[PDB]
Design an enzyme around this catalytic site. Structure first.
Site, short mmCIF file in Angstrom:
data_model
loop_
_atom_site.label_atom_id
_atom_site.label_comp_id
_atom_site.label_asym_id
_atom_site.label_seq_id
_atom_site.Cartn_x
_atom_site.Cartn_y
_atom_site.Cartn_z
N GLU A 153 0.82 -1.21 0.00
CA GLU A 153 0.00 0.00 0.00
C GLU A 153 0.86 1.27 0.00
O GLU A 153 0.58 2.21 -0.75
CB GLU A 153 -0.95 0.02 1.21
CG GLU A 153 -2.08 -1.00 1.16
CD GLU A 153 -3.10 -0.72 0.07
OE1 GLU A 153 -3.02 0.35 -0.58
OE2 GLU A 153 -3.96 -1.59 -0.16
N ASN A 164 -7.69 9.01 -5.76
CA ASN A 164 -8.52 8.08 -6.52
C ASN A 164 -9.31 8.80 -7.62
O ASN A 164 -9.48 10.02 -7.58
CB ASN A 164 -9.48 7.34 -5.58
CG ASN A 164 -8.75 6.62 -4.46
OD1 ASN A 164 -7.77 5.91 -4.70
ND2 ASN A 164 -9.21 6.82 -3.23
N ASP A 172 -12.34 8.95 -8.27
CA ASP A 172 -13.62 9.52 -7.84
C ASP A 172 -13.43 10.80 -7.03
O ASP A 172 -14.39 11.43 -6.62
CB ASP A 172 -14.43 8.48 -7.04
CG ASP A 172 -13.77 8.09 -5.71
OD1 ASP A 172 -12.67 8.57 -5.39
OD2 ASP A 172 -14.37 7.27 -4.98
N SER A 190 -11.70 10.98 -4.12
CA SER A 190 -11.24 10.66 -2.77
C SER A 190 -9.72 10.49 -2.78
O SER A 190 -9.11 10.45 -3.84
CB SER A 190 -11.92 9.39 -2.25
OG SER A 190 -11.58 8.27 -3.06
N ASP A 227 -6.37 8.32 -0.64
CA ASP A 227 -5.89 7.31 0.31
C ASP A 227 -4.70 7.85 1.10
O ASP A 227 -3.80 8.45 0.52
CB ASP A 227 -5.47 6.02 -0.41
CG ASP A 227 -6.60 5.37 -1.17
OD1 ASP A 227 -7.78 5.64 -0.86
OD2 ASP A 227 -6.31 4.54 -2.05
N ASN A 235 -8.92 5.29 2.92
CA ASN A 235 -9.66 6.11 1.95
C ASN A 235 -10.58 7.14 2.59
O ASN A 235 -11.41 6.80 3.43
CB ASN A 235 -10.48 5.16 1.06
CG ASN A 235 -10.93 5.79 -0.24
OD1 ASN A 235 -10.98 7.01 -0.39
ND2 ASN A 235 -11.29 4.95 -1.20
#
Ligand code: BR
Ligand code: BR
Ligand code: BR
Ligand code: BR
Ligand code: BR
Ligand code: BR
Ligand code: BR
Ligand code: NA
EC number: 3.2.1.17
Length: 129
Positions: free
Chosen positions: A35, A46, A48, A50, A52, A59
């Protein structure tokens, strides 16, 4: 902070993540590896809108507030910036909530694709635990 492998394993164990929800310490170290490459400051946008955050790339869509993900939740009740600290307490506590929500560690796409079903004990091999 960029953790060493066994350093992170120890910190995760101290914060009670080892065997949490039946996931051995090696699973958590493997997830963090893929990660964030063990980097607490890692951030990734991301598609959309958002973002992380942190060593386990939590998220903002669901788990933390970053003030720029319209419509999102903040289920861990924390600023997303808290997930970037050198101290992993906030990331661990939030991860405990995430892994408890029904889908276990499949919530972490990198864990499912790169750790699940592999020799995850390798990630803590040789560590003084
Ligand atoms: Br490594
Ligand atoms: Br393990
Ligand atoms: Br927001
Ligand atoms: Br922005
Ligand atoms: Br919420
Ligand atoms: Br820590
Ligand atoms: Br599970
Ligand atoms: Na949010």
């Amino acid at each position: 902070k960029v953790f060493g492998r066994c350093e992170l394993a120890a910190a995760m164990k101290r914060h009670g993540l080892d065997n949490y929800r039946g996931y051995s310490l090696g699973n958590w170290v493997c997830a963090a590896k893929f990660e964030s490459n063990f980097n607490t400051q890692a951030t990734n946008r991301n598609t959309d809108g958002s973002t992380d955050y942190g060593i386990l790339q939590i998220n903002s869509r669901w788990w933390c507030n970053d003030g720029r993900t319209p419509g999102s939740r903040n289920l861990c009740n924390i600023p997303c910036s808290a997930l970037l600290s050198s101290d992993i307490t906030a990331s661990v506590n939030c991860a405990k909530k995430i892994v408890s929500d029904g889908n276990g560690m499949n919530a972490w796409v990198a864990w499912r694709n790169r750790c699940k079903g592999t020799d995850v004990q390798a990630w803590i091999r040789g560590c003084r635990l």
